[PDB]
Amino acid sequence: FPATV
Amino acid sequence: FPATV
Amino acid sequence: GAMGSMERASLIQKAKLAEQAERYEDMAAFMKGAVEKGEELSCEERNLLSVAYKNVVGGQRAAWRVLSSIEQKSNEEGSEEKGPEVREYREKVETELQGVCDTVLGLLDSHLIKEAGDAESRVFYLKMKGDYYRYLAEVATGDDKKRIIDSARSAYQEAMDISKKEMPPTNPIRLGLALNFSVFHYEIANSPEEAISLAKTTFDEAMADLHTLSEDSYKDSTLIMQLLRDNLTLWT
Amino acid sequence: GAMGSMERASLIQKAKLAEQAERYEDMAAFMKGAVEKGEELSCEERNLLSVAYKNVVGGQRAAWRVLSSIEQKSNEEGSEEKGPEVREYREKVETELQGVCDTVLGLLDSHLIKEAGDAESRVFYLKMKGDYYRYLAEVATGDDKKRIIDSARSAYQEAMDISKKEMPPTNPIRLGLALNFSVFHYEIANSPEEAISLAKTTFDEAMADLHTLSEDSYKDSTLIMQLLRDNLTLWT
Ligand SMILES: *CC(=O)N1CCC2(CC1)CC(CNC(=O)[C@]1(Nc3ccc(Cl)cc3)C[C@@H](C)O[C@@H](C)C1)C2
Ligand SMILES: *CC(=O)N1CCC2(CC1)CC(CNC(=O)[C@]1(Nc3ccc(Cl)cc3)C[C@@H](C)O[C@@H](C)C1)C2
Ligand SMILES: [Mg+2]
Ligand SMILES: [Mg+2]
Ligand SMILES: [Mg+2]
Ligand SMILES: [Mg+2]
Ligand SMILES: [Mg+2]
Ligand SMILES: [Mg+2]
C-alpha cells in the first residue's frame, strides 16, 4: 500500500 | 520479562 | 457520553497515557470526550485526536483487507463452498470500521470544522474529513459510492485551496494533506496521472522552500517529503 | 450470551478468521461462545481458546506495566503532583484485565475442567487456570493476594502431578506447563531457586527423551526447551 499520514 | 507460553 | 463527568484536562492527560500504553481505543474515547466539551482544540490536542483514530481505523482496515482477500479467494472457480461465515465476519468488521469513520466525521461536523478559522486548524480538520470519507470509500460497493468519493474529494480540495493560499509549501500539514490527496487520486478516484503530478509538484515546491527553514523545521518537512518520493517510486 | 444464536462450527470458523486478521478480542469472544455450547473442545479448539485469551490478556498486562511504571515514578521524591489520573487509568486497565481473567477462569470452572478426563486436556486446562491466577497475582496488592497466589500454585501443582504420571517429558504441554510454573516460582512466589531447579530438571529430562521422537515432534519439543534455556540464562 502507498504511504499516508 | 522471562519467557512463558 | 460516558466521558461527560470527566474534566477536559483529565481526558487530555489520559489520552497521553493511553498513547504511551498503545491503548488507541481508549485514547480515541478520551479525545472524543475532550472534543465534546465544546471548546476548540489546540495544535497538540488536534494531533492527539488524529493519532488515536488513525490507529484505531488503521487496525480495522488491515483486518478488513485480510478478510476481503479470503472472501475473494472463496468466490474463485474451484473454491469449496464454506457457507456465509467469511462474508458475515468481513461485514462485522466493515460495520465497525464504518462506525468509527462516522464517529470521527460527526466530531468534525459537530462542531470542529465550523469553529476552525485559522488556516492550520481548518486545513488539518478538512484533511481528516477527506481521510475518513476515503476509508468509507475503500469499503463502499453500493448506490452511494460515488457520493462518498465525492465527499472525500470535496474536503481534500477545500483543504488544498486554503493550504496553497495560507501556508508555505514546506508546512507539514500542507505536505501531509497533499500526500494523502495524491493517494486518494491513485487508489480511489482511478486517476494515477493526477496522483503522480500532485506528488511531484508538491515535492518540488517544498524542495525550493527548504532554504527558509531552521534545522528542526527542515527535519519535520523532509520526513514527509520522503514519503512523497516513496510513493512516486512505487508508481513509476 | 451474544453468541448464543451462532452455530458452534461457525464460531470456530470465525475464531480462525479472527486469528488470521489479528482480531484477538473477537477471537476470544467467538471461542467463549463455542465453549458455552457445552460440548468438550478438541485439541485444536483448546489451542484456539488459549491463543485468543493469551493475546488479549498479554496486551492488557503490557499496558498495565507501562501505567504502573508511570505511577511509581509519580510517587518518588521530587515528583510533581499531577492528580488522580494516572492511578485512575491504571485502575481502569487493571479492572479490565481482572475481568478477562475472571472470564477465562469462569469457562474453566463452568465446566471445562470437570469434563476433562484425558491427561492432555486436563493438564492443558489446569495450566491455563494457573496462568490466569498468576495474571491476577501480578496486579494483586490486597487481603486476598496470598489466596490468589495459592490458587495459581494449586492449579499448576495438580497439572504437574498429572503430567509427570501420564505424559512423556518431551510432551509440549508438559514442557509449557513447567516453563510457566518455573516463572511463577521466580516472579510470583519469590522462589528463584525453585524456578531454576524446575527449569533445569525439565530441560534435562526432555533432552534424554528426544531420541524417541520423530523429526516433527523433535522440532516441537526443542522449540519450547529453548525457552527453558533462555530463562536459565536470564537467571544465572
Ligand atoms: C497542530 C498541527 O498543525 N500539527 C499537528 C502535529 C503535526 C503537524 C502540525 C506535527 C506532527 C508530526 N507528525 C508527523 O510528521 C507524522 N504524522 C503526520 C504529519 C502530518 C499530518 Cl497533517 C498528520 C500526521 C508522524 C511521524 C511519526 O511520521 C511522519 C512521516 C508523519 C503532526
Ligand atoms: C491440544 C493440545 O494438547 N495442544 C494444543 C496445541 C499445542 C500443544 C498441544 C501445539 C501448539 C504449539 N504451540 C507452541 O509450541 C507455542 N505455544 C504453546 C506451547 C505449549 C502450550 Cl501448553 C501452550 C502454548 C506457540 C509457538 C508459536 O511458540 C512456542 C514456543 C510455544 C500448542
Ligand atoms: Mg471543567
Ligand atoms: Mg456492508
Ligand atoms: Mg494542479
Ligand atoms: Mg447447532
Ligand atoms: Mg484495583
Ligand atoms: Mg522437584
Side-chain angles (χ1 to χ4, degrees):
Chain A
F1 49 86
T4 58
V5 300
Chain B
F1 49 86
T4 58
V5 300
Chain C
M3 300 302 171
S5 59
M6 207 187 305
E7 288 279 16
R8 188 187 189 279
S10 300
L11 290 162
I12 296 298
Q13 185 181 350
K14 292 178 184 180
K16 291 174 188 176
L17 294 171
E19 185 181 30
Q20 290 179 84
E22 295 179 71
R23 290 276 292 198
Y24 295 104
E25 181 178 47
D26 287 348
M27 191 188 178
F30 294 140
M31 289 312 300
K32 177 174 187 294
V35 169
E36 292 174 346
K37 299 301 177 184
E39 301 286 357
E40 295 184 38
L41 304 191
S42 70
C43 177
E44 182 176 7
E45 295 161 355
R46 293 192 294 274
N47 179 65
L48 295 166
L49 176 69
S50 180
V51 164
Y53 282 110
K54 168 175 168 59
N55 273 267
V56 168
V57 192
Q60 297 174 314
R61 290 163 71 212
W64 185 94
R65 287 176 192 168
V66 166
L67 299 170
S68 184
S69 174
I70 296 168
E71 189 180 13
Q72 282 177 84
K73 186 77 182 181
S74 83
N75 294 130
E76 293 183 349
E77 190 277 321
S79 296
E80 192 57 39
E81 179 57 52
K82 299 296 173 35
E85 294 87 351
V86 170
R87 176 190 50 78
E88 286 171 352
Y89 186 48
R90 185 270 300 158
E91 286 173 352
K92 182 190 166 166
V93 173
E94 186 171 298
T95 301
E96 289 185 20
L97 184 159
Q98 294 169 321
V100 173
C101 293
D102 291 342
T103 292
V104 174
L105 294 164
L107 293 172
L108 297 171
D109 199 50
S110 300
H111 300 278
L112 291 168
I113 291 169
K114 70 177 61 60
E115 299 182 359
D118 294 353
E120 294 71 24
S121 56
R122 190 170 187 83
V123 174
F124 189 88
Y125 293 138
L126 290 166
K127 175 189 170 292
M128 290 180 64
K129 184 173 182 176
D131 291 335
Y132 287 88
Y133 276 114
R134 169 161 63 86
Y135 307 151
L136 292 175
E138 288 176 335
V139 305
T141 61
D143 273 10
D144 278 341
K145 185 178 183 56
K146 281 171 182 173
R147 277 180 281 271
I148 288 166
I149 288 173
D150 204 62
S151 284
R153 183 206 56 73
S154 181
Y156 284 137
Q157 189 57 244
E158 188 184 343
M160 290 292 290
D161 295 341
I162 298 166
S163 75
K164 285 185 248 222
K165 185 182 301 207
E166 301 294 346
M167 289 171 161
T170 48
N171 176 272
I173 303 162
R174 182 162 167 184
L175 293 171
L177 164 63
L179 179 75
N180 290 17
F181 189 32
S182 166
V183 168
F184 167 85
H185 289 302
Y186 197 92
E187 291 287 326
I188 311 294
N190 195 32
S191 302
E193 294 175 330
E194 189 66 19
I196 292 166
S197 190
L198 180 54
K200 287 176 167 173
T201 294
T202 301
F203 181 96
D204 289 343
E205 286 197 286
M207 181 67 33
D209 185 59
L210 290 171
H211 78 272
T212 66
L213 301 182
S214 71
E215 176 172 312
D216 288 348
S217 295
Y218 174 97
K219 174 163 163 185
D220 294 341
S221 296
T222 57
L223 183 68
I224 304 161
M225 290 168 67
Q226 185 61 51
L227 299 179
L228 293 163
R229 174 62 48 203
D230 290 342
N231 284 356
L232 285 164
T233 296
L234 184 68
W235 295 338
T236 61
Chain D
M3 300 302 171
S5 59
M6 207 187 305
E7 288 279 16
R8 188 187 189 279
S10 300
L11 290 162
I12 296 298
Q13 185 181 350
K14 292 178 184 180
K16 291 174 188 176
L17 294 171
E19 185 181 30
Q20 290 179 84
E22 295 179 71
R23 290 276 292 198
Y24 295 104
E25 181 178 47
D26 287 348
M27 191 188 178
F30 294 140
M31 289 312 300
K32 177 174 187 294
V35 169
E36 292 174 346
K37 299 301 177 184
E39 301 286 357
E40 295 184 38
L41 304 191
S42 70
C43 177
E44 182 176 7
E45 295 161 355
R46 293 192 294 274
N47 179 65
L48 295 166
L49 176 69
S50 180
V51 164
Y53 282 110
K54 168 175 168 59
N55 273 267
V56 168
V57 192
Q60 297 174 314
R61 290 163 71 212
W64 185 94
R65 287 176 192 168
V66 166
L67 299 170
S68 184
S69 174
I70 296 168
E71 189 180 13
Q72 282 177 84
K73 186 77 182 181
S74 83
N75 294 130
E76 293 183 349
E77 190 277 321
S79 296
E80 192 57 39
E81 179 57 52
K82 299 296 173 35
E85 294 87 351
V86 170
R87 176 190 50 78
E88 286 171 352
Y89 186 48
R90 185 270 300 158
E91 286 173 352
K92 182 190 166 166
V93 173
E94 186 171 298
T95 301
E96 289 185 20
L97 184 159
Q98 294 169 321
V100 173
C101 293
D102 291 342
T103 292
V104 174
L105 294 164
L107 293 172
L108 297 171
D109 199 50
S110 300
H111 300 278
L112 291 168
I113 291 169
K114 70 177 61 60
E115 299 182 359
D118 294 353
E120 294 71 24
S121 56
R122 190 170 187 83
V123 174
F124 189 88
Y125 293 138
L126 290 166
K127 175 189 170 292
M128 290 180 64
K129 184 173 182 176
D131 291 335
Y132 287 88
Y133 276 114
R134 169 161 63 86
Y135 307 151
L136 292 175
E138 288 176 335
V139 305
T141 61
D143 273 10
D144 278 341
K145 185 178 183 56
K146 281 171 182 173
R147 277 180 281 271
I148 288 166
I149 288 173
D150 204 62
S151 284
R153 183 206 56 73
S154 181
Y156 284 137
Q157 189 57 244
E158 188 184 343
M160 290 292 290
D161 295 341
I162 298 166
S163 75
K164 285 185 248 222
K165 185 182 301 207
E166 301 294 346
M167 289 171 161
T170 48
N171 176 272
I173 303 162
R174 182 162 167 184
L175 293 171
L177 164 63
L179 179 75
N180 290 17
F181 189 32
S182 166
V183 168
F184 167 85
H185 289 302
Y186 197 92
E187 291 287 326
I188 311 294
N190 195 32
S191 302
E193 294 175 330
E194 189 66 19
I196 292 166
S197 190
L198 180 54
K200 287 176 167 173
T201 294
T202 301
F203 181 96
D204 289 343
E205 286 197 286
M207 181 67 33
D209 185 59
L210 290 171
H211 78 272
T212 66
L213 301 182
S214 71
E215 176 172 312
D216 288 348
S217 295
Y218 174 97
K219 174 163 163 185
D220 294 341
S221 296
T222 57
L223 183 68
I224 304 161
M225 290 168 67
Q226 185 61 51
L227 299 179
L228 293 163
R229 174 62 48 203
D230 290 342
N231 284 356
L232 285 164
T233 296
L234 184 68
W235 295 338
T236 61

